[PDB]
C-alpha cells in the first residue's frame, strides 16, 4: 500500500462523487444542466481530478474562485466552460479571454473598460461574461432592475464581450425559514422579466446552490451550481434532515502511527503546556498531522481519531505538524498502524460534520482548509491513483 | 503596484527577517550556530526565500517537517544541511541519502533497518542522522539513558549512517514557571554526560527553540533552532514582555477592495445567514479573502481590517473566498483601495498576535495556515520581488 516519507494523506473517492452527481441530476429537472463548483482546490479535494470526474458523469460546466484557478484546469486539458464567481481585475481580461475563461461582472464601467482593453490588444478571442444580480446576499452583483438594464446594454454593445449567463445567490436557502429565499427568487424573476419586456433574450439563467437544488428544485432554471453536495456533504443539518437526496462523503483523511510508547518514566507530561499527564502504563501514539495541515489546534485534548475501529482521544495540545493520542492503559497499537482522522474505519466514523460541530464551524471550512502539503489519492472503480 | 487577477497577496519583508536573525545572533553565545526552522512552508511565509535569506544572514542549517519539504528547498538550489524534525518512514531512506537530507531517528531497529537498505544499494551519500532525546515533550525521541546508549551504539555500528547531531525539545520554555524547563535541561545534560562517560564523543548538540534561546541563551550549546522568532513573532506574551530581544514581524496580508456600495434599497442583508443588516446609508466593501485562504470563519462578525489607517469591521459572516466590511454610513472608499488584513497601515496595526488572541489560538497557527493560493511577494533592501 501507499509509500510516503511523512505518512499523512487524503483519499478522495470519485465513485462517491459520481453517486452524488447522479443523485442531484435525478432530483432536479431533466432540462437543467449542472455546473460543478470546484473553487478553493475543489473544496480541498483537488480541483483537477474532481472536475474531470464531474464532467464525465453529468456536469456541463465548472465554477472557480479566480482566473488562476481556471487556468490550472485548462492546463489539465479541460475544455468545458469555466466561470469565475468572484471579482476579476481588469488587469486579467486579456489573459482570461486567451484561456477561454468566463468572468462574472455587473458594472457598466467594468464592461466598457474590459472591452477597450481587448480592442487595444487586437481581440484574438471574445471574453465570455456572466452577470451577477445581487438579490440579497449583499456580496457582489447589480441590485436594481434599471442598473441591470444599463449593464446589459453596455455588455451587448461590447463586441469583444459575449453574454453567456445571468445569475444570483441565495443567502439562506439552507434554513427552515424560507421567507428570504422566496423573496430573492421573486426579485430575481422580476428583474429577468423586466429585461424580457425590453425585448432582451436571456442567456443561461442559474440561481441554485446545493441547498436550493435539494429544497427548491423548481428554481433550477437552466442550470444549478453544485458545490458542497458534489463532495457528499450537505449544506446544513436542516437540508440533510429533509431526506430528499442521498449523498456519500467523498473525502477521508488518514495517517500511520509514527511512534508508540508506554509512559513508564517521569515526567509523563504530553505536548506543549504540559496540559496532559499520562499514567505509568498508559500507551501514547504519535501521529504526523498538525494544525499547519488544517487539523485545528482547538481539537487540543478534545478530538478523536479511529484506530482499530475505535475512537481514541487527542492527548494534550495539537502541535504544528504532530498530535498525540492515547491508546489507554496497555493499549494495543504499533508503529505503522493506519489511523483515520476524518472518515470511516471498520464500524466507526468521525465525520467532517462531527468535527465541524466540535469546532463550531461548518463542513465547508473543515475540508477547504486542508493544506496542499497533504498528498491526495483518488479512488475510482474501487482502486487508487494520483 | 502588484497586478493580480484576484487581488489578495502576502508581503514578506526579508529586511525584517535579517534583523530578527541578527537580534538573536547578538543575544546567544557567539560560538552557537543557528538552524533556521522553515517547516510548514516557512511558517506560511514561503520556505524557499526565507531559507535563502537566512542562510545568507546568520543561519547555517535548516529544519523542516518532512523529507518532501526538504526536497522542495534542494530543488531551489539550497545546499545547506537540512534536518527533518519528525518521523521519516524507512521507505524514504534511499531518497533522503540521494538528496543529502538529514533525518531524525531514535530507535535501534530503525537505525539497523535503514543501514541495511543502504548497504544493499552501496552507492549513495552516508545518510546523516540526528538522535532525538525525549526529555518531557512526550512526542518523539528516546526517553532513557540505557536505551539512548543502545541507539548510539547501533548508529555507530551502522557504517552507512553518520551521526551529526543530538537534540531535545522544551515543552514549556515560553512560560513564567521555569521548573519543567530546568528539569528538561538537567535531564538532557545528564544523558549526554552519561554518553561521555562511556567514552562517546558528541556531535552537534541543540536544544533551544526561540523561547529558550531568548530566556535561556546559556542553553544554546552548539546550535539553536530558530522558528517563530525568525518571522519576527514571539513564542508567548511572557517571552515578549521580558523585553530582551527586539523582533520585527516579517508578514503582512493585504487585499484590494473588489466592490464598494451603499445599501440604499431592500433587502440590506449581508452575507450568509443574513446575520448582519446594513443601514440605508451604510457603505459595504467586498474583499477577495475568505476562510479557504486561512482567514478564520470565526472572524465572521468580529474581525477588523485596515482601510485608510482605520479599523473597519467584518460585517456578517466570512465566506469561502470573500468577506464584506463596513466603511460605515456615508462612506469614503473606492474599488481598488488597498486594505491591510494582517499588519500595519499608517499608524494603525492589526497584528497576527491580536488575531490569534481573538481566536483563542497562537500566532504560529495564524501564519502557518495561510493558503498557498495567496501569492507571496518578498521585500529585500526596501524593494519588492518574486
Ligand atoms: C461557493 C459558492 C457556491 C457553492 O454552493 P454550495 O452551497 O456549496 O452548493 C454557490 N454559489 C456561489 C455564488 C458561491 O460562491
Ligand atoms: C517547530 C519546532 C521548532 C520551532 O521553535 P519555535 O521557536 O517555537 O518556532 C523548534 N524545534 C523543534 C523540534 C520544532 O519541531
Ligand atoms: Cl455573490
Ligand atoms: Cl519531539
PDB file of N, CA and C and ligand atoms in Angstrom, chain A residues 272 286 319 322 324, chain B residues 85-86 106 132-135 137-141 167-170 225, ligand 4:
ATOM      1  N   UNK A 272       2.929  20.514  24.260  1.00  0.00           N
ATOM      2  CA  UNK A 272       3.121  21.867  24.784  1.00  0.00           C
ATOM      3  C   UNK A 272       2.165  22.197  25.964  1.00  0.00           C
ATOM      4  N   UNK A 286       2.003   8.701  18.532  1.00  0.00           N
ATOM      5  CA  UNK A 286       2.260   9.982  17.853  1.00  0.00           C
ATOM      6  C   UNK A 286       1.937   9.897  16.369  1.00  0.00           C
ATOM      7  N   UNK A 319       0.123  20.114  17.874  1.00  0.00           N
ATOM      8  CA  UNK A 319       1.314  20.894  17.551  1.00  0.00           C
ATOM      9  C   UNK A 319       1.274  21.193  16.058  1.00  0.00           C
ATOM     10  N   UNK A 322       2.254  17.625  14.342  1.00  0.00           N
ATOM     11  CA  UNK A 322       2.033  16.343  15.009  1.00  0.00           C
ATOM     12  C   UNK A 322       0.972  16.427  16.097  1.00  0.00           C
ATOM     13  N   UNK A 324      -0.606  13.776  19.486  1.00  0.00           N
ATOM     14  CA  UNK A 324      -0.516  12.571  20.298  1.00  0.00           C
ATOM     15  C   UNK A 324      -1.914  12.116  20.654  1.00  0.00           C
TER      16      UNK A 324
ATOM     17  N   UNK B  85      12.598  17.075  11.274  1.00  0.00           N
ATOM     18  CA  UNK B  85      12.338  17.027  12.745  1.00  0.00           C
ATOM     19  C   UNK B  85      11.399  15.889  13.184  1.00  0.00           C
ATOM     20  N   UNK B  86      10.581  15.423  12.251  1.00  0.00           N
ATOM     21  CA  UNK B  86       9.609  14.400  12.559  1.00  0.00           C
ATOM     22  C   UNK B  86      10.071  13.036  12.125  1.00  0.00           C
ATOM     23  N   UNK B 106      15.517   7.598  16.516  1.00  0.00           N
ATOM     24  CA  UNK B 106      15.806   7.418  17.937  1.00  0.00           C
ATOM     25  C   UNK B 106      15.501   5.987  18.433  1.00  0.00           C
ATOM     26  N   UNK B 132      17.007  12.180  18.472  1.00  0.00           N
ATOM     27  CA  UNK B 132      16.052  12.888  19.320  1.00  0.00           C
ATOM     28  C   UNK B 132      15.963  12.242  20.714  1.00  0.00           C
ATOM     29  N   UNK B 133      16.278  13.012  21.754  1.00  0.00           N
ATOM     30  CA  UNK B 133      16.051  12.596  23.144  1.00  0.00           C
ATOM     31  C   UNK B 133      14.813  13.278  23.655  1.00  0.00           C
ATOM     32  N   UNK B 134      13.830  12.484  24.062  1.00  0.00           N
ATOM     33  CA  UNK B 134      12.579  12.998  24.621  1.00  0.00           C
ATOM     34  C   UNK B 134      12.804  13.191  26.114  1.00  0.00           C
ATOM     35  N   UNK B 135      12.898  14.448  26.549  1.00  0.00           N
ATOM     36  CA  UNK B 135      13.083  14.791  27.956  1.00  0.00           C
ATOM     37  C   UNK B 135      11.813  15.324  28.597  1.00  0.00           C
ATOM     38  N   UNK B 137       8.699  16.370  26.304  1.00  0.00           N
ATOM     39  CA  UNK B 137       7.722  16.815  25.332  1.00  0.00           C
ATOM     40  C   UNK B 137       6.779  15.659  25.032  1.00  0.00           C
ATOM     41  N   UNK B 138       7.271  14.437  25.204  1.00  0.00           N
ATOM     42  CA  UNK B 138       6.464  13.244  25.006  1.00  0.00           C
ATOM     43  C   UNK B 138       5.965  12.985  23.580  1.00  0.00           C
ATOM     44  N   UNK B 139       6.657  13.534  22.580  1.00  0.00           N
ATOM     45  CA  UNK B 139       6.208  13.472  21.183  1.00  0.00           C
ATOM     46  C   UNK B 139       7.030  12.427  20.426  1.00  0.00           C
ATOM     47  N   UNK B 140       8.276  12.745  20.125  1.00  0.00           N
ATOM     48  CA  UNK B 140       9.198  11.739  19.613  1.00  0.00           C
ATOM     49  C   UNK B 140      10.480  11.759  20.445  1.00  0.00           C
ATOM     50  N   UNK B 141      11.249  10.674  20.373  1.00  0.00           N
ATOM     51  CA  UNK B 141      12.575  10.620  20.967  1.00  0.00           C
ATOM     52  C   UNK B 141      12.734   9.493  21.956  1.00  0.00           C
ATOM     53  N   UNK B 167      19.610  16.080  19.954  1.00  0.00           N
ATOM     54  CA  UNK B 167      18.759  17.151  20.410  1.00  0.00           C
ATOM     55  C   UNK B 167      17.616  16.714  21.317  1.00  0.00           C
ATOM     56  N   UNK B 168      17.082  17.709  22.003  1.00  0.00           N
ATOM     57  CA  UNK B 168      15.811  17.595  22.674  1.00  0.00           C
ATOM     58  C   UNK B 168      14.995  18.847  22.475  1.00  0.00           C
ATOM     59  N   UNK B 169      13.746  18.745  22.875  1.00  0.00           N
ATOM     60  CA  UNK B 169      12.749  19.764  22.772  1.00  0.00           C
ATOM     61  C   UNK B 169      12.038  20.099  24.121  1.00  0.00           C
ATOM     62  N   UNK B 170      12.045  21.368  24.424  1.00  0.00           N
ATOM     63  CA  UNK B 170      11.439  22.043  25.584  1.00  0.00           C
ATOM     64  C   UNK B 170       9.952  22.229  25.327  1.00  0.00           C
ATOM     65  N   UNK B 225      17.534  26.238  17.447  1.00  0.00           N
ATOM     66  CA  UNK B 225      16.583  26.107  16.366  1.00  0.00           C
ATOM     67  C   UNK B 225      15.664  27.301  16.405  1.00  0.00           C
TER      68      UNK B 225
HETATM   69 CL1  LIG C   4       9.865  15.970  19.564  1.00  0.00          CL
END
